[PDB]
Every structure is written in C-alpha cells, then in structure tokens.
Amino acid sequence: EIVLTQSPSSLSASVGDRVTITCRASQSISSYLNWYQQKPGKAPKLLIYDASSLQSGVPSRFSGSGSGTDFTLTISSLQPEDFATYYCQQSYSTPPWTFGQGTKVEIKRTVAAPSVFIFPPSDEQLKSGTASVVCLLNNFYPREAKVQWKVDNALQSGNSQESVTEQDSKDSTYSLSSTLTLSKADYEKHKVYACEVTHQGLSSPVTKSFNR
Amino acid sequence: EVQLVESGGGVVQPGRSLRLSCAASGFTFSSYGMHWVRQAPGKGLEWVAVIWYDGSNKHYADSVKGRFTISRDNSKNTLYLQMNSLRAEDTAVYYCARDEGTMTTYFDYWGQGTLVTVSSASTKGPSVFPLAPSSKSTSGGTAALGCLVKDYFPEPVTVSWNSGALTSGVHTFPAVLQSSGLYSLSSVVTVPSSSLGTQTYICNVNHKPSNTKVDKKVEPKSC
Amino acid sequence: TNLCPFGEVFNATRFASVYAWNRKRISNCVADYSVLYNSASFSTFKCYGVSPTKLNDLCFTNVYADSFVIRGDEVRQIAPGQTGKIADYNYKLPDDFTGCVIAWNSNNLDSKVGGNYNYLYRLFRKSNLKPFERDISTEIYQAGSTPCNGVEGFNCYFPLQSYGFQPTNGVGYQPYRVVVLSFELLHAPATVCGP
Ligand SMILES: *[C@@H]1O[C@H](CO)[C@@H](O)[C@H](O)[C@H]1NC(C)=O
C-alpha cells in the first residue's frame, strides 16, 4: 500500500489569491496522481489527472505539478466557487486506490462578533422528563469560539454538545449551537442558567442568562 | 451526458445484508471498469471495490474482501454491490465511479451517492420542540427562534420554514449523534422583532425513513 | 487459440526456489489475465505502474513471468523499493517497476507431514542484489577475518537456508507461490496483447 499525506489539512485564503496544496507519497509514484474537488454534500469532481493534465471543462486557473514523491496543486486566482475540500489520490500501486485526508479551502473575511441568544427548555419537553437548554451563536468569524455553560455560576463539562455550520454561502460567516441536556428533576433543582461566549470579535466574554 | 444514479441505501441492522445498484447512462458500459468508493461522514474518501470491463477478476479491499461482493450487468448498464454482514463502521455515503486511462486508473465521473446507515438502533420519528423568541421585543434587534428536532433515527431530516417560504437567515445545524444512539438537530432563524406580532412562524420537519411529517408552530412567549 | 502459456507458469506442478527464481518469457501470443487472480482469501494481487483494470486492453512488447515460493510474511517484500532478506539477497524489483505481483497460499501443495524442505532461500551476501539479479553461488559466506576455505565454522556460514514448510505452520510461515509479471514496451511490433 501507499500512504498519502496532504498539507495543510486546512487553510484560509481570500478571493483571487494564489492557493497551494501539497501531497506527499511514501514512495515514488512517478506522475500517477490526481486531484478531486468536493463541496459539502455534493459528489467529488475530477480536476487534474496524471500530475499536470487539465480535465475538460475545468477552468485554467487550476494547475497541478510534481514529480517523484511530492506533488502540488495551485489555484492562480481563487474564486468563491472554489470553497471546497481537495483530495489527492495516487493510482500507481493499485489496488487499493488510496485517497488523501483532504484539504478544506476556506474563504476569508472580516472579524464579526457572534449574536448570542439563549433558549430555555420548552414545557413540552419538560413534561417528557428531559431539559435541553440551547445557546445560539449567529454569524461570526473566525470559527474559533469558546462556549461555556454555567448553572448557578458552576462551570459545566461533559453534558453539552456543539454543532457548527459550514461557511455561509452569502456572508462567509459561521453559526454554532450548544445544547446542554439534563433530566427534568435535576433541571428543577437549580435557578440560573447562563451561556458564556468568548470570541475574538468581543472585547470581553458575553453572558446570556435566565432564571427557571 | 454521462450520468450515474445510485440506489439502494437505507437502514441496516448489524449482521444483515443490503444490495446497492448504480445505473449508468451516456457511454459504452462494456468498455469501462467500474469502482465503488465510500465516504464516512466525518472521515474522507475511501476506495472499496472495482470490477473490470464485462466482469472479471474483481479486486476488493481489506476489511471487505470476504464480506462484500461487486458485480455488473452490461445489458441493464448497471453496477451492483452486495454487502453482507454489515458492521457499524460501514455506515457511509457510497459513490460509483468510472475508469479511464491508457494505463493507470482515475475516476473521471461520479454519481450523487446513496446513504447507508448500519446500526442496531430502531427507526424512530423525531420529537419537535419549539425554541420560542425572547419576549424582550425591542425596535429592531433581530430576535431568534427555531425548532429542536430530537431523538430520531436515521439520517436525514429535512427542515423548512413556512412550507419552504422562509429562507433568509435560516441556519439548520448538522445533526449530532447522542449517547443513546439517536440523532439531534437544531434549526434556528433570525427575524425582525416587528414581525413577532404579525408573522406566524412554523417549522416543517420531515423524516422519510419513519414517515414523520411535523408542522410545529413557534410563537412568541406568553406571560 | 494462440493464448499465452499462463497456465503452465501458475499451475505448474513444482515451483522454483526464491533464490533461483524461474523466468519464463511470454511473446507472440494474446494474453487474457482473467484466468489469473481467482479472488479467494489470502491471495494478493498488486499492480505497480500499470493498472489491472486495463491489462486486457493493452499491448506490450514482452511479458516476463518470474516464479518462486516464499512464506506468508515475506510476500510484502516482493514490491518495488522494499528491503529485507528476500528483497536484498534473493529477488530484487527495480524502482521503475511497471508490472504486477500475484501471490497465493499453497499450503496444500508445498507442505507435507514431516516437512517439505526442498525450497531454499539465501540468507547472507556480501552486497545487496541489483534489480532482476540471480545468484546461484553456493560459496561459503565469510563474516570474519579468516578465509573460510570451502568449509564453514567460526564466522563462516552457508549462504542457503531451508524454509521448512509444514501443513501445521502459521499463515505467516505457510508456503506462498508468487508470480511476478514484468511488462516491457520496447520498439518493435508489440506481440503480446489482449482482447
Ligand atoms: C489451474 O488454473 C485455474 C485458472 O483459473 C485455477 O482456477 C485452478 O485452481 C488451477 N488449478 C487446478 C488444479 O485447476
């Protein structure tokens, strides 16, 4: 077998900038490597085949080049349609056809502070014996953000789940949801529930609180 | 021109079997080798199997060699993959791909894929709960509301607003897998405070594997 | 008609030792590799350079077929670039290799009660073997300062060693039959082709 390693695993570039992704093989595979583009949810598409050949229909801004064990795909002018993950795959020693781990290209924009909202558990679910407190971070950049739960000023751990959306197609912002789940009785044993957000766009961590 | 349409994905419990098909259109099927390649949500791309032209010494992959079975049919222009004794780690979106090259092999054309979820859990409809907008209705201040779609299996759930009439400002978070083995998801939407008194806000949640269609109205908070 | 003698190489009754691997040339025929890898278990089929899915629709100048017998764990050494006892002192594949490697377990054929010790392998050599080099010399290896003088003893050993293929062995040590196809595309009317 042959192990392929992409670099970097993720990157952040702006429109028109030249982007460069490298793919390293554990042994020489001549020029028997190809590139694939995959958008979230959609199927992969062929871009470059045999190191440095442009597939028909693919714009000329893409260009692959390499020889031996180290190959490189370059985008001369990044475009908004290029926000996708890029995979390198060798086809020298087959089977098996080995893929790369993927390089997600991210479109960069301006720092934006998240809009923080808190949602207490509805009575409908409180009747079912489970309480789910939701904390929503709307439209922020960059993706790094720390969400901390506090029940009567006590930091929570291991009872919350986070979900993050992909970069928005319109404004290139992220959105995050943190769900804290407790039993009904244990929910009734406390009063203050707070969501604390630490983000680069915020001068200080912001807290959204509510009493039961 | 070149089109590959997959079919057969769904729910499988561990140990059982499932057959997938891939219908091709737009090329001479008997002259190209075919590939089956899976992608586990969260992971990257993984090659599974390949069949020659016409069907001959099919090449598999390890952790699959004795379990799956790839075949084809040039008459119906169809490629088949029969998975046997499916394990939990086989849950993935499966794609069929074509071969090309003098020597070498690259996948020039792919299909949209098909989802296969393998778990011992039971197909269950989701519980939809409202996340009501805050009663502090300022003058502009965009407020947020939404729906918590909890405890369902398997993926996916389709969430729309006002029967698909509200798109701006809608964020449906990717589903998360809970410790109980069921999925949870949250769909939020930001609206002007002015609209809270005027606009009826209803989330439409559709779960096809359990045939559960729920129209839950999210209303402002009472007193 | 005029099909290449692939049957008399793979299904041959008795294989050759890995140190004295047997090379059979294939030319002036049509090749149908669909009668080669019968899937099965533990059987390995790795094509380095040329993809397998197009082997039946390609034309080559010559096809050399090397044949030998090793053990289970030494199957992976039969590959371009790898190193090891077999890859260094027995059978070496070039870095620009353009061919395929087939291997299958033959425990029911090359093993017998009491042990089949007819298969040998070279253990020591003064230097690594170059690609496609065959060494059948039975000269005493000299690991010390004194000349061995045709006999072995202190720092003097025999270069050949018996495998020891018993039907009760482990999969890693059961005898495996290996056939390496090397495809050569020179500058002449290409004789070997496929459907
Ligand atoms: C001979 O070669 C054929 C090729 O398909 C193979 O199936 C078979 O196992 C081999 N041995 C015998 C004894 O037929």
Residue numbers in the entry:
A (entry chain D): 1 to 212
B (entry chain C): 1 to 223
C (entry chain A): 333 to 527
Paper text:
The target of these therapeutics is the homotrimeric spike (S) glycoprotein exposed on the virion surface, which mediates the fusion of viral and host membranes after attachment to the human angiotensin converting enzyme 2 (ACE-2) receptor. On the S protein, the major target of the neutralizing response is the receptor binding domain (RBD), which transiently shifts between up and down conformations, thus representing a target where some epitopes are differentially exposed depending on RBD state. Here, we describe the isolation of a set of human mAbs isolated from a convalescent unvaccinated COVID-19 patient who experienced a confirmed primary infection with the Gamma variant. In line with previous studies, the binding epitopes of the five neutralizing COVA309 mAbs are mainly located in the immunodominant RBD of the S.
We only obtained a crystal structure of the COVA309-22 antibody binding fragment (Fab) in complex with SARS-CoV-2 WT RBD at 3.7 Å resolution. The HC and LC of COVA309-22 and CR3022 bind the RBD with a swapped orientation, suggesting that, although the footprint is the same, the residues involved in the antigen recognition and interaction are different. The three CDRs of the COVA309-22 HC (CDRH1, H2, and H3) account for the majority of the interactions, burying 31 Å2, 377 Å2, and 232 Å2 of surface area (BSA), respectively, while the CDRL1, CDRL3, and HFR3 contribute to 73 Å2, 280 Å2, and 64 Å2 of the total 1057 Å2 BSA. Aromatic residues of COVA309-22 IGHV W52, H58, and IGLV P95 stack with RBD residues Y365, F377, and P384, whereas IGLV Y92 contacts RBD-Y380 and P412. Moreover, IGHV M99 forms hydrophobic interactions with RBD-V382, F392, and T430. In accordance with competition experiments, the structure confirmed that the ACE-2 receptor binding site is far from the epitope recognized by this antibody and that COVA309-22 does not interfere with receptor binding. The crystal structure of COVA309-22 showed that the antibody targets the same epitope as COVA309-38, explaining the breadth of the antibody, albeit with a lower potency compared to mAbs targeting the RBS. The epitope of COVA309-22 also extensively overlaps with that of previously described mAbs, including CR302246 and EY6A,54 indicating once again that this RBD region represents a key site of vulnerability on the S protein. Among the RBD-targeting mAbs, COVA309-22, -35, and -38 were the broadest, with COVA309-22 binding to all RBDs of the tested variants, while COVA309-03 and -10 seemed to be more strain specific. When tested against the latest Omicron sub-variants, COVA309-22 maintained neutralization activity (IC50 13.6, 27.4, and 26.7 μg/mL against Omicron BA.4/5, BQ.1.1, and XBB.1, respectively), in accordance with the observed binding breadth.
